[PDB]
Design a protein around this nucleic acid. Structure first.
Ligand code: MG
Ligand code: MG
Ligand code: MG
Ligand code: MG
Ligand code: MG
Ligand code: MG
Ligand code: MG
Ligand code: MG
Ligand code: MG
Ligand code: ZN
Lengths: 134, 136, 38, 125, 94
RNA sequence: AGCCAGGAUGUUGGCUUAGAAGCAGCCAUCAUUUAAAGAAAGCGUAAUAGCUCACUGGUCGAGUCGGCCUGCGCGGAAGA
């Protein structure tokens, strides 16, 4: 029962993926290319989280979830890297429509009651990496 | 290390340390280190201490030093008989009577200040306590 | 056994005791915190 | 912690949703993750259900606010109450399937009409 | 509101004062106004815990002396040099 | 105080790094479901995982916490 964050159409380098979930009994290339077959639709350069579920027989089922609050906030403000000094140094900007798009993606991925709760959790990740909401 | 820029006379009578202190109260900072016991503070002591509580506050808030080492102490060196004058001037001291306020402090959290003052007092010869400025 | 005239709690698991008229500091966690007064 | 004023206000909020609520279900909350509990909180805000874990001797003071007083012996043991403010049922049908899904805790005693319902007959709701 | 109970001082001087302070009581005074001064004694503890609030210094308090209140303010107070103690209090008639 | 239970999502917050995922280091430290759950008080990893803590519900059943001021004692305390 492991989790990783893997770039869009990508898999099977040695340090990020193979050892981590490969010491758990998982076949590495089925995860790799069924995850690049599922996440071929995610834009190039966004890490997308993947939850791997392993069973006593090593046959696994993974739910690929929507890209992180921090990655959809990197892309919706246009930027590459967020702030090394958040809310002191501010690195980009998103109007409330992008807070709400990222929070519809994460409306599929949150615990929130309303799209205002998911927009507010994406508001929180918007204040975390320094980005301004405008 | 504190010491009078220039003096009227070079040497002094041993004098006594008697009676109680003036400046019993904290007139600048919110907190102060008061002396309970009676003794002489060399400049070295005061300096080391001021250092201690300067490390302790990470150079924040503010620190006053209310005491000054203005009276010169002498010593004849080893292997020297009595007489032949008064000894040479070794170092400087401040006479301390019970209830003087050695350092004042403010712009800091109280807890932190009690701490810094414990660390400051580790370097001092005499019995000391923590105190707060009051209204009247 | 740090043997000294000022003995203290060096963490949250250190527990002070007086055994046979000696003040010691006993730790479960850290053998290095074992102290006696003297 | 909680001041007496804190406890007083909270007794007023439980008594206030208790007056407004159509039906309630008391259950054991022990031995279940906050993941499945936020799952029954989503399945709660979706069913109109008001979910709570409240102190026992606090809930004797709030339930003295009537007509749930048949539940004051159901407060021995950890207490998680589901008030359905919208619809009756949808708490009692959701809890049996959540406790059979988890196979943890209990779901002990319900209350409707002013009477208490024993554990195997909560299938009435 | 602060109410301080007190007695009239039958004695004076350094000796009286230090016997007062030994007994866990302390001397204070009430002056100001048309009247004559009134020297009184107090319980060290009550007042020490009472001036442990700030308003004590900014406010009109009352002093119960032989059945009779007076309304006063805190004028100045001399404290023992290193000890958590009070040597004396100047009360000015309010 | 003990003992049962949980210590959640966004999320591996961004920075940085071959790796930093609460726990090298730099900066922010928000919001959600909340009974409660620090962008985490320590052990832990190549980095994770793994282990307690803060915090809260349960059982328990009446006093408990730590400063202040003093009285008398303990250690500090070895020599022909
Ligand atoms: Mg003289
Ligand atoms: Mg003078
Ligand atoms: Mg023995
Ligand atoms: Mg006379
Ligand atoms: Mg005399
Ligand atoms: Mg307890
Ligand atoms: Mg008490
Ligand atoms: Mg001895
Ligand atoms: Mg020996
Ligand atoms: Zn220890």
């Amino acid at each position: 029962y492991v989790k990783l964050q893997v770039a869009a159409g990508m898999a099977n380098p040695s340090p990020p993926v193979g050892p981590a979930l490969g010491q758990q009994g998982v076949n590495i290339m089925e995860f790799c290319k069924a995850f690049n077959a599922k996440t071929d639709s995610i834009e190039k350069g966004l890490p997308i989280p993947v939850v791997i579920t392993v069973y006593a027989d090593r046959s696994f089922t993974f739910v690929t979830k929507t890209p992180p609050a921090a990655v959809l906030l990197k892309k919706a403000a246009g930027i590459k890297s967020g702030s090394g000094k958040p809310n002191k140094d501010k690195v980009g900007k998103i109007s409330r429509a992008q807070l709400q798009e990222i929070a519809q993606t994460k409306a599929a991925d949150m615990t929130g009651a309303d799209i205002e709760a998911m927009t507010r959790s994406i508001e929180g990740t918007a204040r975390s990496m320094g980005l301004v909401v405008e | 290390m504190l010491q009078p820029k220039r003096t009227k006379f070079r040497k002094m009578h041993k004098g006594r340390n008697r009676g109680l202190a003036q400046g019993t109260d904290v007139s600048f900072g919110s907190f102060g280190l008061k002396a309970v016991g009676r003794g002489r503070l060399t400049a070295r002591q005061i300096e080391a201490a001021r250092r201690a509580m300067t490390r302790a506050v990470k150079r924040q808030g503010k620190i006053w030093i209310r005491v000054f080492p203005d009276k010169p102490i002498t010593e004849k060196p080893l292997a020297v008989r009595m007489g032949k004058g008064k000894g040479n001037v070794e170092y400087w001291v401040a006479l301390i009577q019970p209830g003087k306020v050695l350092y004042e402090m403010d712009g800091v959290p109280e807890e932190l200040a009690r701490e810094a003052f414990k660390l400051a007092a580790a370097k001092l010869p005499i019995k000391t306590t923590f105190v707060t400025k009051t209204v009247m | 056994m740090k043997v000294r005239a000022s003995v203290k709690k060096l963490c949250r698991n250190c527990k002070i005791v007086k055994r046979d008229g000696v003040i010691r500091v006993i730790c479960s966690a850290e053998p290095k915190h074992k102290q006696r007064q003297g | 912690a909680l001041n007496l004023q804190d406890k007083q206000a909270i007794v007023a909020e439980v008594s206030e949703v208790a007056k407004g609520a159509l039906s309630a279900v008391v259950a054991d909350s022990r031995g279940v993750t906050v993941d499945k509990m936020t799952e029954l909180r989503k399945a709660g805000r979706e069913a109109g259900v008001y979910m709570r874990v409240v102190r026992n001797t606090l809930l004797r003071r709030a339930v003295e606010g009537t007509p749930f007083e048949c539940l004051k012996d159901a407060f021995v043991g950890p207490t998680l109450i589901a008030y359905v403010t919208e619809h009756p049922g949808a708490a009692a049908r959701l809890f049996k399937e959540f406790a059979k899904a988890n196979a943890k805790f209990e779901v002990k005693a319900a209350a409707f009409e002013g009477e208490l319902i024993p554990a195997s007959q909560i299938d009435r709701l | 509101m602060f109410t301080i109970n007190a007695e009239v001082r039958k004695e004076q001087g350094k000796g009286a004062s230090r016997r007062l302070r030994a007994a866990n009581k302390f001397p204070a005074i009430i002056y100001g106004g048309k009247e004559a001064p009134l020297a009184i004694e107090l319980d060290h503890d009550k007042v020490m815990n009472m001036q442990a609030k700030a308003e004590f210094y900014s406010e009109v308090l009352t002093i119960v002396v032989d059945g009779k209140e007076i309304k006063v303010k805190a004028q100045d107070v001399q404290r023992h040099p290193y000890k958590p103690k009070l040597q004396h209090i100047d009360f000015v008639r309010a």
